[PDB]
Amino acid sequence: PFPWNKIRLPEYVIPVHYDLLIHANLTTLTFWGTTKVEITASQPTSTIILHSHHLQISRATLRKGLSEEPLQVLEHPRQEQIALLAPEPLLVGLPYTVVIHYAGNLSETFHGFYKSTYRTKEGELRILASTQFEPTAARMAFPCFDEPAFKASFSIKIRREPRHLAISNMPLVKSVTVAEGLIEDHFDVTVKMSTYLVAFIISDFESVSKITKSGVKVSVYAVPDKINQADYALDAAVTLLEFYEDYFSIPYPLPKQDLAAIPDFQSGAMENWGLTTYRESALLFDAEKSSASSKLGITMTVAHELAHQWFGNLVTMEWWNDLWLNEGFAKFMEFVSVSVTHPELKVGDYFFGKCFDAMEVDALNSSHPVSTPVENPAQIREMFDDVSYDKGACILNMLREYLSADAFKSGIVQYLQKHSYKNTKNEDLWDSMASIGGGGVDVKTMMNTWTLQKGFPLITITVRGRNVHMKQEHYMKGDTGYLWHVPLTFITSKSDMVHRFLLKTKTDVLILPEEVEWIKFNVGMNGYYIVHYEDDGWDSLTGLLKGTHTAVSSNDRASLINNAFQLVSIGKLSIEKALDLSLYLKHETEIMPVFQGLNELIPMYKLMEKRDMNEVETQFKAFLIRLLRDLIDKQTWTDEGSVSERMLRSQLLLLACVHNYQPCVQRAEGYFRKWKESNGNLSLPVDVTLAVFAVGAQSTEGWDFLYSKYQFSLSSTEKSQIEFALCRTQNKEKLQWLLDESFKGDKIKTQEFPQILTLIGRNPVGYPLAWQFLRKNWNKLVQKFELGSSSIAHMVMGTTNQFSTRTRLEEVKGFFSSLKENGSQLRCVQQTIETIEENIGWMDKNFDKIRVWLQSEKLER
Ligand SMILES: *[C@@H]1O[C@H](CO)[C@@H](O[C@@H]2O[C@H](CO)[C@@H](O[C@@H]3O[C@H](CO)[C@@H](O)[C@H](O)[C@@H]3O)[C@H](O)[C@H]2NC(C)=O)[C@H](O)[C@H]1NC(C)=O
Ligand SMILES: *[C@@H]1O[C@H](CO)[C@@H](O[C@@H]2O[C@H](CO)[C@@H](O[C@@H]3O[C@H](CO)[C@@H](O)[C@H](O)[C@@H]3O)[C@H](O)[C@H]2NC(C)=O)[C@H](O)[C@H]1NC(C)=O
Ligand SMILES: CC(C)C[C@H](CP(=O)(O)[C@@H](N)CCc1ccccc1)C(=O)N[C@@H](Cc1c[nH]c2ccccc12)C(N)=O
Ligand SMILES: *[C@@H]1O[C@H](CO)[C@@H](O)[C@H](O)[C@H]1NC(C)=O
Ligand SMILES: [Zn+2]
Predict the structure, then answer these.
(1) Which of 170, 391, 415, 545 is the most buried (most CB within 10 A)?
(2) SS percent in the chain: helix, strand, coil, step 5
(3) What is the CATH number of domain 456-557?
(4) What's the CATH number for 206-347+404-440?
């Protein structure tokens, strides 16, 4: 009979200091550990409950202070807990020391204390051991009070062979030759931090280091053959760390900051205090082969983790229900920091795709509020979704633009200083914001309306001369009674000046000083809502876009497109009028509106490919190509221009070459011929590399040649482009081979499996293979990627969310229901089901309409 029955830990036993000794054996893939945890008790008890998972406990003692007493061990695998029973009840106010000896073996997965391998340039395979403890994986490496609220200090000691190199959260204090033939590294003691931030790495990495203007030792570790790609990472890391220190007015508390490129990683990165971990693709930059997209991604990722150093590490959420207080703030500090440190990137151009893609799912009935209760690890992993990142950052952007940027900065500085080295709830942020908003600004109620209910509002705007009527309702892809405090912003045809109005009720009205030709709400996509215009409003905006699209901003044009199509999804606008608005892209030239038009148009022919709709689908693809043909023709085949122009060129050339624009196809075939005859030695323009590989991979010869180069390539961008090209094939046998080998993890590492599966589910001849593979290997995939993880969500959605028929809907429902306790309760499952339902509705309503509209559009030249 186990003396505990709740998933949460007892509140009356608090740890204060962990002392960890880990001996990891790379040859036998084992490790023995000793954990000494100093605790205090507030209620007299003889039972100590803590976390432990897949760890063999062999010995347990309890020291008082002199006196040491044995503890009896009880195990609960369902709750991932152990209970330690003490002969004499603990005395309140006294410090005790629990000492546990345990053993286990490096996880073969992507979490806990797991193994990674890398290939040398001589073909040899080398092994290292890394950590990934967020959210509840520290218990797989050391028994502890594995919750973010039980903060404590950590004194770490790691045992290794001499041939190895050990790094952790703190600097290395000393090395002692314990026993014979293996060294023991004693690291400095950490600060008050949560348990999920513990990390340690045993490898043979090389490193590059640099000093900040504040004296912190910033270093970047990687495998020996890839250390020469860490320069941009290190430089941007120093710049962003100095920026964050200066901005928050709070120095970095640790002596050193490390950025390690792990060969086997699940997430993009991890914010381990003093030892951030990354994907090699997400940290390393090769000037010869990496793309401008890759450079921007590295910059944004480094900014994200260095922001986590404050939002998450210094001030941590108390429970995983408010994980957005970490993740949304970090995703927003990405923008706030990079837009200052690397202004040549101009991240304000590409930020709001996050808000749009987040609305795509938050408009669903299965969506959840930004802050929602969770208990078990599957739910906690599910919390790392588009809401907590994208929607959190978008509502934070809206709040910072409603308040002054100066007021937002003062609020966040007060927040971090008041709650440093502690935990916060959702309400502490609103308290810190209301301590600054004193012009009649109740931040609390507004942000409660934005964080405590799901979805986002639709604002309908009616104009009767000089009167502007505004009505808010809950946008829901088919009546609840939700209400927001929407800080509306708008401009008129008579003024580029931004006028504001705070809509706190269902309907309201303001008075213009003069009649206007058009009015545009949600200026610059700084608000997390969508806008509909009554009467001839959409016609007026269509005329504006087709006449002088430069009358409004790039973000405004993108928001117009996205809002038009999302309103088609609920009937406030016809699909025909939406496409009439889309026709303006024939003269569009900016990256954000073009990319938004593509992101809103591609899913339609993606839905059509899954059905018998060849004529209408071909008409649609031809129309899409003819829409951008002028811009595609004007695009050059070089690496010229800014980062924005380079990414635009790459995507345009890839799109044209995929949809069979014969000039693009001919030139890409020529480049691929010259390259293949050069044996990969010819340097191709990184921007056109995607299109060249995608064209060359259509034939079996070029496909096999590309794969032959894949094994030995060392550029992560080159690897990703090769993956995309190989997934673009029509050979079912090769698709099956890619799937199986990326699953096995030998020829293609498993970290790339979810993206490869998603691309193959996009493939018009591969989607049954992807769906069937996910179904038939669900068990091992779940064991590898954890339940409810963003990887599982990505796989499920990439394999199913393009289905459009009731037969497919029943397939999905039946399979995920028969899964029972192994994934039937997945929020991603519910979201895919609702997405398929909305796809069915949208297809039954708009497909034949689109066919008629395409015939009408061909009858236009
Ligand atoms: C992980 O486990 C492996 C295997 O149990 C350990 O390898 C063994 O390590 C010991 C001590 O280093 C070796 O003994 C010594 O080998 C050297 C080799 O020149 C010899 O000169 C010494 O007199 C002594 O025999 C042992 O040979 C070696 N076994 C083999 C064949 O690899 C490894 O050390 C463990 N790593 C740690 C520190 O956890
Ligand atoms: C990873 O480490 C664990 C230990 O933490 C290894 O567990 C060991 O597994 C073997 C094989 O199952 C166990 O032997 C078994 O004994 C049970 C009855 O006690 C018997 O029913 C089984 O048929 C088998 O003979 C062994 O007991 C267990 N560890 C301990 C200390 O009991 C595990 O094998 C390691 N990883 C892998 C992949 O093996
Ligand atoms: C690029 C940048 C924003 C870094 C960031 C890493 P972190 O700093 O948000 C880390 N703390 C995630 C921790 C984690 C790991 C595994 C399961 C759940 C939670 C990221 O990759 N975001 C992606 C991908 C992602 C987040 N959680 C994941 C969990 C599994 C797989 C992928 C992900 C996103 N926008 O979600
Ligand atoms: C949304 O989904 C839930 C199931 O969790 C269902 O009970 C509810 O009825 C759905 N929406 C509506 C229209 O009520
Ligand atoms: Zn994060």
Answers:
(1) 391
(2) 45, 20, 30
(3) 2.60.40.1910
(4) 1.10.390.10
